[PDB]
Write a protein that binds this DNA or RNA. Structure first.
Ligand SMILES: [Mg+2]
Ligand SMILES: [Mg+2]
Ligand SMILES: [Mg+2]
Ligand SMILES: [Mg+2]
Ligand SMILES: [Mg+2]
Ligand SMILES: [Mg+2]
Ligand SMILES: [Mg+2]
Ligand SMILES: [Mg+2]
Ligand SMILES: [Mg+2]
Ligand SMILES: [Mg+2]
Ligand SMILES: [Mg+2]
Ligand SMILES: [Mg+2]
Ligand SMILES: [Mg+2]
Ligand SMILES: [Mg+2]
Ligand SMILES: [Mg+2]
Ligand SMILES: [Mg+2]
Ligand SMILES: [Mg+2]
Ligand SMILES: [Mg+2]
Ligand SMILES: [Mg+2]
Ligand SMILES: [Mg+2]
Ligand SMILES: [Mg+2]
Ligand SMILES: [Mg+2]
Ligand SMILES: [Mg+2]
Ligand SMILES: [Mg+2]
Ligand SMILES: [Mg+2]
Ligand SMILES: [Mg+2]
Ligand SMILES: [Mg+2]
Ligand SMILES: [Mg+2]
Ligand SMILES: [Mg+2]
Ligand SMILES: [Mg+2]
Ligand SMILES: [Mg+2]
Ligand SMILES: [Mg+2]
Ligand SMILES: [Mg+2]
Ligand SMILES: [Mg+2]
Ligand SMILES: [Mg+2]
Ligand SMILES: [Mg+2]
Ligand SMILES: [Mg+2]
Ligand SMILES: [Mg+2]
Ligand SMILES: [Mg+2]
Ligand SMILES: [Mg+2]
Ligand SMILES: [Mg+2]
Ligand SMILES: [Mg+2]
Ligand SMILES: [Mg+2]
Ligand SMILES: [Mg+2]
Ligand SMILES: [Mg+2]
Ligand SMILES: [Mg+2]
Ligand SMILES: [Mg+2]
Ligand SMILES: [Mg+2]
Ligand SMILES: [Mg+2]
Ligand SMILES: [Mg+2]
Ligand SMILES: [Mg+2]
Ligand SMILES: [Mg+2]
Ligand SMILES: [Mg+2]
Ligand SMILES: [Mg+2]
Ligand SMILES: [Mg+2]
Ligand SMILES: [Mg+2]
Lengths: 274, 47
RNA sequence: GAAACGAUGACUGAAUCCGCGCGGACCACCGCGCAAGGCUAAAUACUCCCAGUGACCGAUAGCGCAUAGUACCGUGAGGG
RNA sequence: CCCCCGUGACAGGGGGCGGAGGACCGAACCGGUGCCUGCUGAAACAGUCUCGGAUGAGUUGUGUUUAGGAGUGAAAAGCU
RNA sequence: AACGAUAAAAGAAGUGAGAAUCUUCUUCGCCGUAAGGACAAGGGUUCCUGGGGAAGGGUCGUCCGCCCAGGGAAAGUCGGGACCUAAGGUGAGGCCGAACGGCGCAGCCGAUGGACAGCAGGUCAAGAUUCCUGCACCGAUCAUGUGGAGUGAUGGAGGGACGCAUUACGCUAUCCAAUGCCAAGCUAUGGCUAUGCUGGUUGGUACGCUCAAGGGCGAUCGGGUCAGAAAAUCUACCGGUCACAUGCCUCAGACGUAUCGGGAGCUUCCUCGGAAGCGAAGUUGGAAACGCGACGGUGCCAAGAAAAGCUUCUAAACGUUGAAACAUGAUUGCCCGUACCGCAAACCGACACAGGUGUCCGAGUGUCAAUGCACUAAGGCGCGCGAGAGAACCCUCGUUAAGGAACUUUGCAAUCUCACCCCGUAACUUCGGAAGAAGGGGUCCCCACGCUUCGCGUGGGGCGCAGUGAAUAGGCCCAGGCGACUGUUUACCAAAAUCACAGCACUCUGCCAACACGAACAGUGGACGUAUAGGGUGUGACGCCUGCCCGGUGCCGGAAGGUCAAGUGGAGCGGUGCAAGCUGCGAAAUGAAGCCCCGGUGAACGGCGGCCGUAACUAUAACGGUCCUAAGGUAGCGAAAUUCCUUGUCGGGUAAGUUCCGACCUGCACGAAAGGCGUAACGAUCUGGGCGCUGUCUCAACGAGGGACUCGGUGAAAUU
């Protein structure tokens, strides 16, 4: 499930690593690898924006299609399950009788060598790409889009599930991994099943280093900073705030809602996340 | 110890250069201002 | 400010001759005026350059220079 | 991974082998712990001796991006 | 004062107006993973020749990196460009913005990377993969022949195309050995008389049935439209078929032969010493790369550029008695870069400055190994004042009777320890460790014997005070505080108990996400991510745990009501004119979010406390404990990085202990994620104790070297 390590260096006890024994040892497709340069969390005016990003292993992008409507009707077979660095999920390769090779997110269980079919006429088995309405109620599913053909924007990270509460208007009531209930147009595609890896939540980083290998620069406690630097800065010791917990920019953290008050999407949220 | 000025032809040209100075109104304004002072050295590319 | 009048950013929007606009809230009266269409020399300003003059200076003075924006300082702007 | 030994509800244990590590001693390189010298210096921050790191959160060249209430900062109001 | 590292100088000879400083000779000394050699960046004539000597040179100069003059740098093949793309910069159109302007797809610029044809020698005083010689190679254009029907883009596909660690086989560069080969001459000072001594010992090209490890490997037919916009002998699917051991293919390098060089030196001429001519040998044994075969093998997770050239297929096209393709010949060959310094006296440091500067090369002997240490080769250098003295005092060193931390704020400093082999090794623990714990032994030479060699074991013998015989080369332990750990920080007084950290919690965020930079309905980060994700906040491995208080404050939620701005509505009040009318002010009712108010909320800000009585002069060491604000301390801890009283009290250690340890509880003024109490391990952290050892000390001596002193040369400064 996970690889462990004898304590032969101090930071090697707690450490753990993912199980790769089920990944077909393959270089990604030459026709599908794109070049992904990094950013410091800097934007086209050169300023840090996203804060504490840098370093980490060099990464290539592997193009995916989520909107499978390109290849609806025809079906392919599972060629392999490879490793993708930029995603929590393992991904998998598709060989169509059509002749095209494509990449789709790889769901929990789905084995190499299986065949899978996109398009309205497809069974409720793992991997098929169905419109939402054609999905039997209470089904477990992921890769839900918010607009038909726009592409899967929901349920993508490892071990995530969307469970269809059930049909309604033009739309279908949907259960989001956050515990939030949403309305989604039934014309939107989806892909049958739980996401995969799933044990991902259990891995242990172990040594500072690991953070750096995942391009995460150390994260700075405000309380260490200075008055000039940040609200929690100053005082003559280890200090406890001295005011409400607050972001660098001053807006309250811990408890203050933030979603914009007047918004279109609201009349599609049936229950708040809780 | 390592000192401030560490010569680099391409640096100097790309930074204090004539093309550089002309690329912007403020650099154009240097050019004119200098011409006016009667400098032998209008700009770094004059060296 | 009792705040007229011009001026627009937003919203709104009338009369054309017994008509219209002003006259320092506002009304009558009495006066001055023809908006929403354009150009216009002359008297005025300045002084890089040129000429004449001086109870201005004559080599630490007078321009920074009896010439140089040079030598020299500065990554540079710039100083000199 | 390969042989060997152990079965109280028990991981284990031995041997071969393999070659992991913000592992270890230590030079290059990176660094500045402590003392002395130096203090109109050899030097506007160093020298000898001693010391830290030394496959990593490593060191380094080149090209390039970010700036003044602004940048950048494993945070000293440090550095620009 | 000083003349810029204590690496070191001596004599002869020459020159010259003048010499410690210049030139030559002979030695001496110093570097030798460098203080030698080659690039890059930078510098700019500093290079070579001939001359010069005012100033520059920390003295002096006849000399020079200085001054004057003249020479010197040669490329189809090395590097850049006429090719390529990355970050980035640009960018018609296009998207925004008071202006100047900010973005921005394609395209374009952009090497630090992809691509790409030449090697071996020789020589100017100064250039060399450039020139000369010798033999190759590349594209391009044309001619003659082989031609005898295809050529294949601005689009397609293949390909280029990439990580870290480790490692098997073969070789080379290269270095070692020798009664191998070749050349020279000599006999020293007791011996040697060569079996001694010194030096040299194969580079390119071509061919060759010689050897050769390693490395590269599917072919074809057919089907499927739906995939590659379209096309398509190309590509990708699906299906069929082809004698697994391999052969198919390649040949790092080796041997051979031939040929072109080179080669120790030999010769001859000669002009502060060069010029030409000539030319021997080529062994066997051993070591061996980070280089080559190579795009190899295995293992790992953090999952490792792009584009062009290249190969392949059609589109269009012009052809199909001149289409590709080949062979030979001729022709052609642009632009910029090449001198010299280049770990430094020529670059950055105001200096001919003890600093800083990226990559490659970097020999031998000895040493377990090595780019370590000592000595040394090649090569380079003695650091641009010198000479004497041999006081105080100062710096850097050697040794030191007896004692051994008695020094002191503190063993600060300095010593002891020191490599490799064997023996041996504690509490404690997360079973990895602590650990090189501690401690003991061994180490050199000869000879024989055995074994797997460079070597080691065993036995016996030998010499000295001593055998990692010189250099490199851990002192150890017991016990606390803090932090878990590797890491990080105040360039130039703090390296830590600071920060970061893995782990944990709270919370926000449903994607045009929250959040953030923005003239901005632009664009961008977040993220080509999607709640196992992302932001913000605190805590800080791990273990056991993380209590009471929601009154105030802040957040989430509630809603009867009280609420509240513009506005909506103008009942009603005035002004004016004779008046229709124009006009000044303006009340109800209504009217959003937000506050008041109700509830919830601590790993939200925070709170978890006042106190009662003592003989005497308006009073000091000591006291046992009841308890007001929403509540009034659950564990664990406690004289503490927290303790005022304070050297609290007892015990420990000590001859003696304001420090340290343990216990006590009377916690001025601990306490649970501003975390509580522990915790093996880790520490240039802090604190106490011990063993060892020592000039730290009683108490200072003797010695050395560098100054200080003296003489000749040049000659500052703060201050006044
Ligand atoms: Mg964190
Ligand atoms: Mg601080
Ligand atoms: Mg503030
Ligand atoms: Mg504060
Ligand atoms: Mg008006
Ligand atoms: Mg005069
Ligand atoms: Mg280490
Ligand atoms: Mg530092
Ligand atoms: Mg003196
Ligand atoms: Mg000197
Ligand atoms: Mg001397
Ligand atoms: Mg003479
Ligand atoms: Mg001398
Ligand atoms: Mg002589
Ligand atoms: Mg050198
Ligand atoms: Mg040049
Ligand atoms: Mg002189
Ligand atoms: Mg002379
Ligand atoms: Mg010269
Ligand atoms: Mg040639
Ligand atoms: Mg732009
Ligand atoms: Mg390049
Ligand atoms: Mg080439
Ligand atoms: Mg080239
Ligand atoms: Mg090998
Ligand atoms: Mg060899
Ligand atoms: Mg011999
Ligand atoms: Mg004799
Ligand atoms: Mg291109
Ligand atoms: Mg040269
Ligand atoms: Mg200086
Ligand atoms: Mg000197
Ligand atoms: Mg120097
Ligand atoms: Mg070597
Ligand atoms: Mg050596
Ligand atoms: Mg050495
Ligand atoms: Mg020599
Ligand atoms: Mg030299
Ligand atoms: Mg003694
Ligand atoms: Mg003694
Ligand atoms: Mg004592
Ligand atoms: Mg000490
Ligand atoms: Mg043990
Ligand atoms: Mg030992
Ligand atoms: Mg003896
Ligand atoms: Mg002995
Ligand atoms: Mg030592
Ligand atoms: Mg620490
Ligand atoms: Mg450390
Ligand atoms: Mg400091
Ligand atoms: Mg310090
Ligand atoms: Mg309201
Ligand atoms: Mg006592
Ligand atoms: Mg105590
Ligand atoms: Mg803490
Ligand atoms: Mg004198």
């Amino acid at each position: 499930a996970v690889k462990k390590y004898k304590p032969y260096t101090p930071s090697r006890r707690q450490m753990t690593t993912a199980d790769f024994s089920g990944l077909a040892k393959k270089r990604p497709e030459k026709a599908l690898t794109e070049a992904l340069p990094k950013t410091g969390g800097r934007n086209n005016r050169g300023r840090i924006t996203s804060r504490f990003i840098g370093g980490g292993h060099k990464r290539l992008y592997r193009i995916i299609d989520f909107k499978r409507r390109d290849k609806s009707g025809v079906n392919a077979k599972v060629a392999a399950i490879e490793y993708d660095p930029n995603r929590s999920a393992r991904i998998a390769l598709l060989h169509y009788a059509d002749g095209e090779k494509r990449y789709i997110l790889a769901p929990e269980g789905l084995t190499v060598g299986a065949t899978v079919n996109a398009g309205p006429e497809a069974e409720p088995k793992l991997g098929n790409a169905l419109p939402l309405r054609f999905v039997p109620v209470g089904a477990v599913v992921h890769a839900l889009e918010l607009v038909p053909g726009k592409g899967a924007q929901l349920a993508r990270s490892a071990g995530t599930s969307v469970q269809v509460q059930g049909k309604e208007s033009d739309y279908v009531i949907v259960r989001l991994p956050s515990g939030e209930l949403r309305r989604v147009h039934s014309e939107c595609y989806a892909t049958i099943g739980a996401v995969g890896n799933a044990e991902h939540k259990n891995i242990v980083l172990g040594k500072a280093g690991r953070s750096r290998w995942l391009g995460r620069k150390p994260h700075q406690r405000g309380s260490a900073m200075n008055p000039v630097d940040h609200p929690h800065g100053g005082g003559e010791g280890r200090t406890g705030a001295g005011r409400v917990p607050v972001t660098p920019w001053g807006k309250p953290t811990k408890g203050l809602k933030t979603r914009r008050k007047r918004k279109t999407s609201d009349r599609f949220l049936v229950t708040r996340r809780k | 110890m390592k000192r401030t000025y560490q010569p680099n032809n391409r640096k100097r040209a790309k930074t204090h250069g004539f093309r550089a100075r002309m690329k912007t109104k403020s650099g154009r304004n240097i050019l004119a201002r200098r011409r006016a002072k009667g400098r032998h050295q209008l700009t770094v590319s004059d060296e």
